[PDB]
Amino acid sequence: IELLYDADADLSLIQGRKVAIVGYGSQGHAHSQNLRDSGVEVVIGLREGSKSAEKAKEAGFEVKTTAEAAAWADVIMLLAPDTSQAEIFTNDIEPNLNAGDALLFGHGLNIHFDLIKPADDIIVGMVAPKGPGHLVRRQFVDGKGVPCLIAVDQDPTGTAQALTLSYAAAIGGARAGVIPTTFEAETVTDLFGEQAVLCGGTEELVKVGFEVLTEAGYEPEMAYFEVLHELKLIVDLMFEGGISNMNYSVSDTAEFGGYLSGPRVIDADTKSRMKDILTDIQDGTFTKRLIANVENGNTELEGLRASYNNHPIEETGAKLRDLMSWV
Amino acid sequence: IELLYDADADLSLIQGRKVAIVGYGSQGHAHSQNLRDSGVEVVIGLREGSKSAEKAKEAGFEVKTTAEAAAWADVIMLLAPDTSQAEIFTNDIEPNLNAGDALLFGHGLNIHFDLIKPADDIIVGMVAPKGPGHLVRRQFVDGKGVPCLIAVDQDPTGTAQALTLSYAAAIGGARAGVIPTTFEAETVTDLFGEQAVLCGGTEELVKVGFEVLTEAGYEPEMAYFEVLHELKLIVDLMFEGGISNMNYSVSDTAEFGGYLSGPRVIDADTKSRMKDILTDIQDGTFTKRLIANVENGNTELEGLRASYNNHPIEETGAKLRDLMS
Ligand SMILES: [Mg+2]
Ligand SMILES: [Mg+2]
Ligand SMILES: [Mg+2]
Numbered sequence A: 001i002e003l004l005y006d007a008d009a010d011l012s013l014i015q016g017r018k019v020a021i022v023g024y025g026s027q028g029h030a031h032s033q034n035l036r037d038s039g040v041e042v043v044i045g046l047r048e049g050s051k052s053a054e055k056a057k058e059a060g061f062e063v064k065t066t067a068e069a070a071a072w073a074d075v076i077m078l079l080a081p082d083t084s085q086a087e088i089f090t091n092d093i094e095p096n097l098n099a100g101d102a103l104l105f106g107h108g109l110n111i112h113f114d115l116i117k118p119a120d121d122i123i124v125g126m127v128a129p130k131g132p133g134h135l136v137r138r139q140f141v142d143g144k145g146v147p148c149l150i151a152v153d154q155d156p157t158g159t160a161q162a163l164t165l166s167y168a169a170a171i172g173g174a175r176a177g178v179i180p181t182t183f184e185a186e187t188v189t190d191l192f193g194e195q196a197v198l199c200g201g202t203e204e205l206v207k208v209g210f211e212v213l214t215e216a217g218y219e220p221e222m223a224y225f226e227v228l229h230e231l232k233l234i235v236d237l238m239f240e241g242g243i244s245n246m247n248y249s250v251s252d253t254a255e256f257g258g259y260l261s262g263p264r265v266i267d268a269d270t271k272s273r274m275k276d277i278l279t280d281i282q283d284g285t286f287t288k289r290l291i292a293n294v295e296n297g298n299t300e301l302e303g304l305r306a307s308y309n310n311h312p313i314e315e316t317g318a319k320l321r322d323l324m325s326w327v
Numbered sequence B: 001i002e003l004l005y006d007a008d009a010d011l012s013l014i015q016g017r018k019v020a021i022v023g024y025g026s027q028g029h030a031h032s033q034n035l036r037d038s039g040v041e042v043v044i045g046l047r048e049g050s051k052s053a054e055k056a057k058e059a060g061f062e063v064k065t066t067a068e069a070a071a072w073a074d075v076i077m078l079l080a081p082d083t084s085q086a087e088i089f090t091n092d093i094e095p096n097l098n099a100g101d102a103l104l105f106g107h108g109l110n111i112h113f114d115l116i117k118p119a120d121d122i123i124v125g126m127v128a129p130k131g132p133g134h135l136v137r138r139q140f141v142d143g144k145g146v147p148c149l150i151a152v153d154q155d156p157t158g159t160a161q162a163l164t165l166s167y168a169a170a171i172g173g174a175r176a177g178v179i180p181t182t183f184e185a186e187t188v189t190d191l192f193g194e195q196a197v198l199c200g201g202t203e204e205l206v207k208v209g210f211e212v213l214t215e216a217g218y219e220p221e222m223a224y225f226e227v228l229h230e231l232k233l234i235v236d237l238m239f240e241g242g243i244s245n246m247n248y249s250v251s252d253t254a255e256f257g258g259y260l261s262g263p264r265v266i267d268a269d270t271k272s273r274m275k276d277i278l279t280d281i282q283d284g285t286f287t288k289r290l291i292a293n294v295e296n297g298n299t300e301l302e303g304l305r306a307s308y309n310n311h312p313i314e315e316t317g318a319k320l321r322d323l324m325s
């Protein structure tokens, strides 16, 4: 698919725009500094009566409220928690928007699932780098960058493509490569990856592997080593050179064993269950549950977290890790 | 479950031994160099006209035939590949093992499944570092170490635990913590780990996640990022704190997602299939298939590798990594 670099982007565009970053978390923090270094006048939008308000002042940024910053700005980047964002839009952002203002996102959930429905004459786009804030910043500071996806949901003027590229270009994403995509595509691929593989599938794989060994009479500490601790080597190797590279660098016994037993654990029915996970994301089932959980005071998530992290691999992992930081 | 440290180990024990390292690959080169800086007389034992003989000589080691090295030595650490070990023991090691000599391994496979049966009066132990050769080497140089397992299958002398711990100290493991175990427990946990979770489970999970997105019409590169490239940050998080470090550090949507959907991916049927994989290891069936692979020319393994490697995830990732950090 497509790749855009500095030569393709027009930095003079976002340079000529007042930008408001609503949020000063990991992303907010990196964007703000990189934009500033790229020549962009930036203001942080916050509750102005906040921890962050003073951290942002101390990093050199003018700080206003969410409502005042939205009013002040031409481009509004909304980097608040996915679930706070509807309330923040309705109350503090929507009421201060001019026609021609751009409203930009790090993630497409609120737009794709219609939790935020801006007026037609507003630009809606997305800049989502592929790394956490600190890396986006560090890569930028030493003349490199982190690759970004970009997307446009509302393009009333016909300048949204160039405005989201210009932004990604200012945060260093055009150094590595900017990938145009869609709000739909970004959103469902991300939620899927998290549910099926990254968060859900991985965490349960290791928990259950730990349980099978423990229930068979092996000591928990042995189990923590062969099921979680050694996973970082494997995953570092896959990150560097893919599956082929991991398989090259382990013993042939591990490699042969991986090939026989992996598709016994992840079998055809597993693949169908993943397909159902995907349908559930695409049709809004998941997002229905997501909002239900917030609108019920975050009880389900807090209950899930409380018991799901109450696992003997977490009791055993903490003892051993505490013993290894102790050198 | 005791962790053992430098204060527990008598380093003079392995310092007073002649150590043969049979095999000079990953662990071989590192064990070898670490022992030497811990004051141990080391020799490398390689097959007739081996490629690794040049590497070992250039690194300062007396290199011998396996059989000459086995004869010279008191302690013989066997780090050739698992499927090569039985034959090497019968041809070149077994004939020079004398009362009070010790045979060491870095994995319990051959001893536990009775591929190698030493005589009564030989010490049989293991020192398995929890990390890759190069990491075992560099950690030791920078004053640190990689944790080690140790075990003892045979102990005619009463010195076998002290001897293994001495060796572990000499390669840096006691700096980081040495866990006592058994041959059975290290063998089976390692194998089940590699099969169910580390190599097998993780690679099929990412591979199958990728397919699910490509068949539903999402471009292969989006799928790659969201299924594999992002896996490192997650696993790095679990490496540092635990699962709860990971859940604390991801968005509340990511955390909520994982809780609701992870158990749909890894259900109670998965748990049973894992118990099955365990049972095939414990009863020796995995071992026979490993031996069969290599008696028929290693083609099964070569074919399974090729099948994995020509998977679009491999084409796609290679493309996307070329735009590097
Ligand atoms: Mg305005
Ligand atoms: Mg809409
Ligand atoms: Mg993600």
Ligand SMILES: [Mg+2]
Pocket (backbone or CB within 6 Å): A247, A248, A249, A250, A251, A252
């Ligand atoms: Mg190999």
Ligand SMILES: [Mg+2]
Pocket (backbone or CB within 6 Å): B070, B071, B072, B073, B074, B096, B097, B098, B101
């Ligand atoms: Mg001898």
Ligand SMILES: [Mg+2]
Pocket (backbone or CB within 6 Å): A225, A226, A230, B189, B190, B191, B193, B194
């Ligand atoms: Mg292992």
Ligand SMILES: [Mg+2]
Pocket (backbone or CB within 6 Å): A251, A253, A254, B107, B190, B194
């Ligand atoms: Mg192994």
Ligand SMILES: [Mg+2]
Pocket (backbone or CB within 6 Å): B247, B248, B249, B250, B251, B252
């Ligand atoms: Mg959180």
Ligand SMILES: [Mg+2]
Pocket (backbone or CB within 6 Å): A107, A190, A191, A194, B251, B253, B254
């Ligand atoms: Mg996400």
